[PDB]
């Protein structure tokens, strides 16, 4: 089975990658980073986020596996000491695939750029006040004045969305969550304040009022966009597939990361 | 078609109820408050909450309609001036039914009491510190020390859940949201803090650690329970059905109630 | 010098109290719990809160010292192993006194009851909705609809006030902080939301609108008051005096309790 | 008495400025924008913030007066229709001066730049993660990982500080308030979360851990600083003086801006 391994680049990860490649050499495994079917990420969530975006063109043909050699590693399922057991089970061929929802961002100018997000997509102004009109399913909902907005995937609700006061969403729910970044609320300006959870087929559209330049982020990326007509959020039809070998429930994954471990 | 009308009891609502009953007398409508198929609530959300719990035994045979003669009326779809137009359209027979998810609470002693909630169910201690262990799908998640907890339905996320910092959930999502009530967090005590959104088939169980007496609420009700072994939260299989005659999206319903109208 | 020692009542604290009394027998120390000048609390903040209220009539003649045999002990300055060093230094007579501001609560009926608080005073309704008008210096400020309100002292801002989202206030600032308990905010109801920090000589008055029965708390006490005309908050002119033997800054005291130790 | 008038630059403000100058020509008033003793700002808080920073070198010789021709105008005391009454009373010479505390920011490189703030000073990274060690009075308190930090003056607590969850502080209290901007908190990263209120003579120092480039803001200004060794916060010894002609308490000023008017 075709596979590839990406590494954080530090000593522990590079060496662990070579050992697994040597271990995979003892099975019917072929290293191919062009068309892999198993993508193994050795590092942290940042290394895992990069592996996902490196292969977003074949998310339907790829199952992801995360080994964390770092501090937290929310998307990882493996310690480095358990690596040789992973080589064997992945070679045995039997494991189960679980799928998490993804976010779709479409940006329009005056062409059209689309993006896929595993954690979240956020909007901020390119210096100066950030003002947008929030349109939900072609109905105007509010005018946002603040630092920015964050639209999160389910599995991304434990990341940036959490620090903004958002709720934690189990990834079996196909939804997206929008949170505020320090909105101004007074006699003249009024926002909902609360986070909003949108289901599938619901389209959130941001429309500029004054400045049309915004710094848009997709996970670790941060892009500057000029002459923006509209930013559109939507639950993607594509999903990310994880190869699972034991039971690690999302809520237990939450407990270990934030309560104790 | 069998129907009944409940009223807040004030002058405006009682008179509006008599006019509609007289108006329904001009159609093939029969007043029956024992086995109605249409339940019309004239008043506020409190009047509507009471109508729901008055007929929770036949939620599969009943469609609800809300007329608000009060201040907000989140569950209402009608102004009192539009009442005679409602009599006609409901008599015409053609309207569409929409269904919102409900919450199930099961309380255990040492028998078993169950409840259905449209807004939320909350737990507090019967005086003294409130301490419970939070068990999600038979896995211990946290020990909560604070004033209480609130488990909300989707349509109830705009109510008590909102004031506790929870997120607003579109009612097409079959979920329940758990929020905290002033948990203590220090070197010794640690909670997740963030609200939690659970899908269907997920069972949240609260287990006492010290005191076993808790004041449990279901919407406007507030009960004292003694010798409690376990409180269990779960998305109900039963749903509440609304009779809709025009389009009033949940997000527009949110906008009018909190932004402006 | 006259002194007394109060104890949590468990084995470790009672024995530690007897050892110090025997140790104080080797100096010019006299045990007097009627008119002490040094009050030593062995236990936790709850034990310390009780010692303060046990002697609130002579707060100008008394310096307090806290030994924590429990979990956190925010008001304590001593481990039980350091106890015999405390007997010696307190006998040596030289230590410095620091003073923290106190809160004054005045409740009026239709007589007048006053209270002193070290942590906070909170108001809730006696079952049913809690509605009060908030009057700051005889000017109406807002109508509060929610679960309750919390007025905190500086040293009490790390307690209940903190869990409600309040700010942490250094006790050299003579102020009181008012925080909300789950206020309802919509088209009809509007509160400030933010915590409010009032200086000395500023009088916060709560005035009932409907129900006149409220459950008022002062630290660990919780009282039911009937026929309430007014609840009044104010920075007390009396202060609590602490006997300090080494430097333990408030911010370092904050760090150990909430960051790590 | 020497005075000057600054204007937002729009039609209503420029014309109002000319009318007052013509009105002041009927008294012993001399227009001098080099060494004025009365500075009148016609516009909004942004226009008022600019007038303050335009004359921060003579804050001890200057009393400020605000006329708001815009939307909110928190620092203003006058409607444009009341302008001719202001010319007369200011000419009559009798009014009372009130003083608000100011914030001092000192930035160090590897020289030393200082700034005075009326609202707040905030720190963010120059792209990339923002990590600083928070040192209070030479004692390390926490390592902050997030978007940034905001240190506010009392009168500035109703501005940016409020949108970040901070408390509202009466300006008779000589203090500064530090709030967080979306800190990350998990098993590895831990911050206090709560806002912190520091008294006079308390020195908050931010110390870089990785990147030494930060975008520092002072009110409406935003500067990029390179090779930063330390950012230092402190309650200034200088204060801003307001000319007051009637009673407008800070809490009533708060009520009008956020509750209703
Ligand atoms: C700059 C401060 N960030 C970090 O240091 N991140 C790393 C920490 O994030 C943990 N982590 C990541 C991830 C990742 C790496 O990519 C950058 C991501 O950074 C996040 N982010 C941005 N700004 C943030 C902010 N202010 N507060 C909180 N998070 C913020 C955004 O989600 C962005 O996608 N995913 C998750 C996750 N699903 N669940 C739990 N933890 C996660 C990860 O293990 C590590 O601990
Ligand atoms: C005591 C303070 N409550 C109220 O005054 N309620 C009435 C206000 O609630 C509005 N309203 C109700 C409802 C109802 C009546 O029943 C009592 C309900 O009260 C709520 N509640 C309890 N304590 C609360 C608190 N502290 N803050 C906020 N809400 C709290 C609990 O949900 C409990 O079910 N439903 C909703 C709704 N889906 N969406 C939007 N608004 C709603 C309603 O129209 C009215 O404006
Ligand atoms: C019921 C949940 N409480 C507790 O368990 N308290 C004990 C914890 O409080 C710590 N502690 C106490 C104190 C005390 C004992 O008295 C009861 C006090 O309880 C508080 N309280 C009430 N309800 C609360 C809530 N929901 N959340 C948070 N705190 C709440 C109210 O301030 C009330 O005065 N003082 C402080 C303090 N200055 N700073 C830091 N920690 C403190 C103490 O060491 C222990 O850890
Ligand atoms: C970009 C979004 N800002 C605004 O639009 N500001 C204007 C609104 O601020 C009101 N206003 C100002 C001021 C000012 C102008 O200068 C810029 C200031 O902007 C603030 N600011 C920055 N980012 C913010 C954010 N995310 N949320 C909230 N406020 C933020 C920062 O304090 C910075 O000093 N002072 C105050 C004040 N003391 N009290 C009450 N309202 C005030 C003012 O009248 C107007 O309504």
mmCIF file of N, CA, C and O in Angstrom, chain C residues 163-214:
data_model
loop_
_atom_site.group_PDB
_atom_site.id
_atom_site.type_symbol
_atom_site.label_atom_id
_atom_site.label_comp_id
_atom_site.label_asym_id
_atom_site.label_seq_id
_atom_site.Cartn_x
_atom_site.Cartn_y
_atom_site.Cartn_z
ATOM 1 N N UNK C 163 -14.864 33.563 39.310
ATOM 2 C CA UNK C 163 -15.610 32.578 38.535
ATOM 3 C C UNK C 163 -16.723 33.208 37.712
ATOM 4 O O UNK C 163 -17.196 32.582 36.758
ATOM 5 N N UNK C 164 -17.151 34.420 38.058
ATOM 6 C CA UNK C 164 -18.184 35.131 37.321
ATOM 7 C C UNK C 164 -17.615 36.036 36.237
ATOM 8 O O UNK C 164 -18.355 36.846 35.670
ATOM 9 N N UNK C 165 -16.321 35.929 35.945
ATOM 10 C CA UNK C 165 -15.706 36.752 34.929
ATOM 11 C C UNK C 165 -15.145 38.069 35.419
ATOM 12 O O UNK C 165 -14.684 38.869 34.597
ATOM 13 N N UNK C 166 -15.163 38.319 36.724
ATOM 14 C CA UNK C 166 -14.676 39.576 37.252
ATOM 15 C C UNK C 166 -13.168 39.708 37.158
ATOM 16 O O UNK C 166 -12.435 38.765 36.858
ATOM 17 N N UNK C 167 -12.698 40.919 37.425
ATOM 18 C CA UNK C 167 -11.274 41.205 37.385
ATOM 19 C C UNK C 167 -10.648 40.997 38.760
ATOM 20 O O UNK C 167 -11.327 41.021 39.791
ATOM 21 N N UNK C 168 -9.335 40.794 38.763
ATOM 22 C CA UNK C 168 -8.574 40.596 39.989
ATOM 23 C C UNK C 168 -7.983 41.929 40.426
ATOM 24 O O UNK C 168 -7.279 42.583 39.653
ATOM 25 N N UNK C 169 -8.268 42.323 41.661
ATOM 26 C CA UNK C 169 -7.986 43.665 42.150
ATOM 27 C C UNK C 169 -6.969 43.600 43.282
ATOM 28 O O UNK C 169 -7.162 42.860 44.252
ATOM 29 N N UNK C 170 -5.893 44.376 43.161
ATOM 30 C CA UNK C 170 -4.906 44.417 44.232
ATOM 31 C C UNK C 170 -5.506 45.090 45.464
ATOM 32 O O UNK C 170 -6.153 46.135 45.354
ATOM 33 N N UNK C 171 -5.302 44.515 46.656
ATOM 34 C CA UNK C 171 -5.999 45.008 47.853
ATOM 35 C C UNK C 171 -5.518 46.357 48.362
ATOM 36 O O UNK C 171 -6.092 46.867 49.328
ATOM 37 N N UNK C 172 -4.492 46.964 47.766
ATOM 38 C CA UNK C 172 -4.178 48.341 48.124
ATOM 39 C C UNK C 172 -5.210 49.308 47.562
ATOM 40 O O UNK C 172 -5.315 50.442 48.039
ATOM 41 N N UNK C 173 -5.981 48.873 46.570
ATOM 42 C CA UNK C 173 -7.047 49.686 45.997
ATOM 43 C C UNK C 173 -8.289 49.535 46.864
ATOM 44 O O UNK C 173 -8.798 48.424 47.051
ATOM 45 N N UNK C 174 -8.772 50.649 47.412
ATOM 46 C CA UNK C 174 -9.976 50.646 48.241
ATOM 47 C C UNK C 174 -11.174 50.723 47.304
ATOM 48 O O UNK C 174 -11.607 51.802 46.896
ATOM 49 N N UNK C 175 -11.715 49.562 46.950
ATOM 50 C CA UNK C 175 -12.793 49.508 45.976
ATOM 51 C C UNK C 175 -13.671 48.291 46.231
ATOM 52 O O UNK C 175 -13.371 47.439 47.070
ATOM 53 N N UNK C 176 -14.772 48.230 45.487
ATOM 54 C CA UNK C 176 -15.645 47.070 45.453
ATOM 55 C C UNK C 176 -16.037 46.808 44.007
ATOM 56 O O UNK C 176 -16.192 47.740 43.213
ATOM 57 N N UNK C 177 -16.186 45.531 43.666
ATOM 58 C CA UNK C 177 -16.474 45.116 42.300
ATOM 59 C C UNK C 177 -17.808 44.389 42.254
ATOM 60 O O UNK C 177 -18.039 43.458 43.032
ATOM 61 N N UNK C 178 -18.674 44.810 41.335
ATOM 62 C CA UNK C 178 -19.988 44.211 41.141
ATOM 63 C C UNK C 178 -19.995 43.419 39.842
ATOM 64 O O UNK C 178 -19.646 43.954 38.786
ATOM 65 N N UNK C 179 -20.389 42.151 39.921
ATOM 66 C CA UNK C 179 -20.470 41.285 38.756
ATOM 67 C C UNK C 179 -21.880 40.723 38.617
ATOM 68 O O UNK C 179 -22.652 40.675 39.579
ATOM 69 N N UNK C 180 -22.208 40.300 37.401
ATOM 70 C CA UNK C 180 -23.529 39.771 37.097
ATOM 71 C C UNK C 180 -23.547 38.251 37.202
ATOM 72 O O UNK C 180 -22.521 37.582 37.053
ATOM 73 N N UNK C 181 -24.734 37.711 37.461
ATOM 74 C CA UNK C 181 -24.969 36.269 37.458
ATOM 75 C C UNK C 181 -26.020 35.964 36.397
ATOM 76 O O UNK C 181 -27.221 35.977 36.687
ATOM 77 N N UNK C 182 -25.567 35.701 35.172
ATOM 78 C CA UNK C 182 -26.420 35.236 34.079
ATOM 79 C C UNK C 182 -27.637 36.147 33.885
ATOM 80 O O UNK C 182 -28.788 35.758 34.080
ATOM 81 N N UNK C 183 -27.345 37.384 33.497
ATOM 82 C CA UNK C 183 -28.399 38.320 33.143
ATOM 83 C C UNK C 183 -28.976 37.967 31.779
ATOM 84 O O UNK C 183 -28.272 37.464 30.899
ATOM 85 N N UNK C 184 -30.264 38.238 31.604
ATOM 86 C CA UNK C 184 -30.906 38.063 30.307
ATOM 87 C C UNK C 184 -30.780 39.367 29.529
ATOM 88 O O UNK C 184 -31.046 40.452 30.062
ATOM 89 N N UNK C 185 -30.342 39.267 28.275
ATOM 90 C CA UNK C 185 -30.184 40.422 27.399
ATOM 91 C C UNK C 185 -30.829 40.116 26.054
ATOM 92 O O UNK C 185 -30.399 39.195 25.353
ATOM 93 N N UNK C 186 -31.858 40.888 25.699
ATOM 94 C CA UNK C 186 -32.502 40.758 24.397
ATOM 95 C C UNK C 186 -33.004 42.113 23.908
ATOM 96 O O UNK C 186 -32.443 43.155 24.266
ATOM 97 N N UNK C 187 -34.074 42.114 23.107
ATOM 98 C CA UNK C 187 -34.641 43.374 22.635
ATOM 99 C C UNK C 187 -35.237 44.189 23.776
ATOM 100 O O UNK C 187 -35.243 45.424 23.719
ATOM 101 N N UNK C 188 -35.729 43.521 24.820
ATOM 102 C CA UNK C 188 -36.486 44.174 25.882
ATOM 103 C C UNK C 188 -35.611 44.408 27.109
ATOM 104 O O UNK C 188 -35.754 45.420 27.803
ATOM 105 N N UNK C 189 -34.699 43.482 27.384
ATOM 106 C CA UNK C 189 -33.868 43.527 28.578
ATOM 107 C C UNK C 189 -32.425 43.837 28.201
ATOM 108 O O UNK C 189 -31.881 43.250 27.261
ATOM 109 N N UNK C 190 -31.811 44.764 28.935
ATOM 110 C CA UNK C 190 -30.455 45.204 28.623
ATOM 111 C C UNK C 190 -29.725 45.561 29.907
ATOM 112 O O UNK C 190 -30.209 46.380 30.695
ATOM 113 N N UNK C 191 -28.559 44.955 30.106
ATOM 114 C CA UNK C 191 -27.677 45.264 31.219
ATOM 115 C C UNK C 191 -26.303 45.645 30.683
ATOM 116 O O UNK C 191 -26.013 45.512 29.492
ATOM 117 N N UNK C 192 -25.447 46.120 31.588
ATOM 118 C CA UNK C 192 -24.108 46.527 31.177
ATOM 119 C C UNK C 192 -23.243 45.310 30.868
ATOM 120 O O UNK C 192 -22.330 45.384 30.038
ATOM 121 N N UNK C 193 -23.510 44.177 31.512
ATOM 122 C CA UNK C 193 -22.710 42.988 31.296
ATOM 123 C C UNK C 193 -21.345 43.036 31.954
ATOM 124 O O UNK C 193 -20.983 42.135 32.716
ATOM 125 N N UNK C 194 -20.580 44.087 31.668
ATOM 126 C CA UNK C 194 -19.236 44.211 32.207
ATOM 127 C C UNK C 194 -19.269 44.335 33.731
ATOM 128 O O UNK C 194 -20.232 44.858 34.302
ATOM 129 N N UNK C 195 -18.234 43.847 34.416
ATOM 130 C CA UNK C 195 -18.102 44.135 35.847
ATOM 131 C C UNK C 195 -17.834 45.612 36.081
ATOM 132 O O UNK C 195 -17.276 46.309 35.231
ATOM 133 N N UNK C 196 -18.239 46.087 37.254
ATOM 134 C CA UNK C 196 -18.103 47.488 37.627
ATOM 135 C C UNK C 196 -17.271 47.593 38.894
ATOM 136 O O UNK C 196 -17.530 46.887 39.872
ATOM 137 N N UNK C 197 -16.278 48.476 38.874
ATOM 138 C CA UNK C 197 -15.397 48.711 40.013
ATOM 139 C C UNK C 197 -15.719 50.085 40.585
ATOM 140 O O UNK C 197 -15.528 51.106 39.913
ATOM 141 N N UNK C 198 -16.218 50.109 41.823
ATOM 142 C CA UNK C 198 -16.610 51.350 42.477
ATOM 143 C C UNK C 198 -15.578 51.760 43.518
ATOM 144 O O UNK C 198 -15.067 50.908 44.250
ATOM 145 N N UNK C 199 -15.259 53.044 43.608
ATOM 146 C CA UNK C 199 -14.313 53.520 44.620
ATOM 147 C C UNK C 199 -15.004 53.679 45.971
ATOM 148 O O UNK C 199 -16.169 53.329 46.149
ATOM 149 N N UNK C 200 -14.255 54.221 46.930
ATOM 150 C CA UNK C 200 -14.834 54.578 48.215
ATOM 151 C C UNK C 200 -15.930 55.623 48.031
ATOM 152 O O UNK C 200 -16.027 56.288 46.993
ATOM 153 N N UNK C 201 -16.779 55.743 49.054
ATOM 154 C CA UNK C 201 -17.796 56.787 49.127
ATOM 155 C C UNK C 201 -18.834 56.677 48.016
ATOM 156 O O UNK C 201 -19.729 57.522 47.916
ATOM 157 N N UNK C 202 -18.734 55.648 47.182
ATOM 158 C CA UNK C 202 -19.742 55.366 46.170
ATOM 159 C C UNK C 202 -20.722 54.342 46.720
ATOM 160 O O UNK C 202 -20.310 53.303 47.246
ATOM 161 N N UNK C 203 -22.014 54.636 46.597
ATOM 162 C CA UNK C 203 -23.073 53.834 47.199
ATOM 163 C C UNK C 203 -23.872 53.168 46.088
ATOM 164 O O UNK C 203 -24.522 53.847 45.284
ATOM 165 N N UNK C 204 -23.825 51.838 46.046
ATOM 166 C CA UNK C 204 -24.641 51.042 45.136
ATOM 167 C C UNK C 204 -25.874 50.572 45.894
ATOM 168 O O UNK C 204 -25.758 49.976 46.973
ATOM 169 N N UNK C 205 -27.052 50.843 45.341
ATOM 170 C CA UNK C 205 -28.314 50.491 45.978
ATOM 171 C C UNK C 205 -29.120 49.600 45.046
ATOM 172 O O UNK C 205 -29.316 49.934 43.873
ATOM 173 N N UNK C 206 -29.582 48.467 45.567
ATOM 174 C CA UNK C 206 -30.479 47.581 44.840
ATOM 175 C C UNK C 206 -31.897 47.780 45.362
ATOM 176 O O UNK C 206 -32.120 47.785 46.578
ATOM 177 N N UNK C 207 -32.847 47.950 44.446
ATOM 178 C CA UNK C 207 -34.229 48.256 44.803
ATOM 179 C C UNK C 207 -35.156 47.248 44.135
ATOM 180 O O UNK C 207 -35.116 47.101 42.896
ATOM 181 N N UNK C 208 -35.995 46.545 44.892
ATOM 182 C CA UNK C 208 -36.866 45.531 44.288
ATOM 183 C C UNK C 208 -37.926 46.148 43.388
ATOM 184 O O UNK C 208 -38.375 47.278 43.595
ATOM 185 N N UNK C 209 -38.322 45.384 42.372
ATOM 186 C CA UNK C 209 -39.364 45.790 41.444
ATOM 187 C C UNK C 209 -40.639 44.980 41.640
ATOM 188 O O UNK C 209 -41.740 45.535 41.625
ATOM 189 N N UNK C 210 -40.511 43.668 41.834
ATOM 190 C CA UNK C 210 -41.662 42.805 42.069
ATOM 191 C C UNK C 210 -41.548 42.118 43.423
ATOM 192 O O UNK C 210 -42.004 42.650 44.440
ATOM 193 N N UNK C 211 -40.941 40.934 43.439
ATOM 194 C CA UNK C 211 -40.743 40.206 44.684
ATOM 195 C C UNK C 211 -39.789 40.967 45.596
ATOM 196 O O UNK C 211 -38.805 41.558 45.140
ATOM 197 N N UNK C 212 -40.091 40.959 46.893
ATOM 198 C CA UNK C 212 -39.284 41.654 47.889
ATOM 199 C C UNK C 212 -38.550 40.691 48.814
ATOM 200 O O UNK C 212 -37.993 41.122 49.830
ATOM 201 N N UNK C 213 -38.539 39.403 48.491
ATOM 202 C CA UNK C 213 -37.807 38.404 49.257
ATOM 203 C C UNK C 213 -36.556 37.999 48.490
ATOM 204 O O UNK C 213 -36.638 37.611 47.319
ATOM 205 N N UNK C 214 -35.401 38.084 49.149
ATOM 206 C CA UNK C 214 -34.134 37.761 48.511
ATOM 207 C C UNK C 214 -33.277 36.935 49.459
ATOM 208 O O UNK C 214 -33.281 37.168 50.672
#
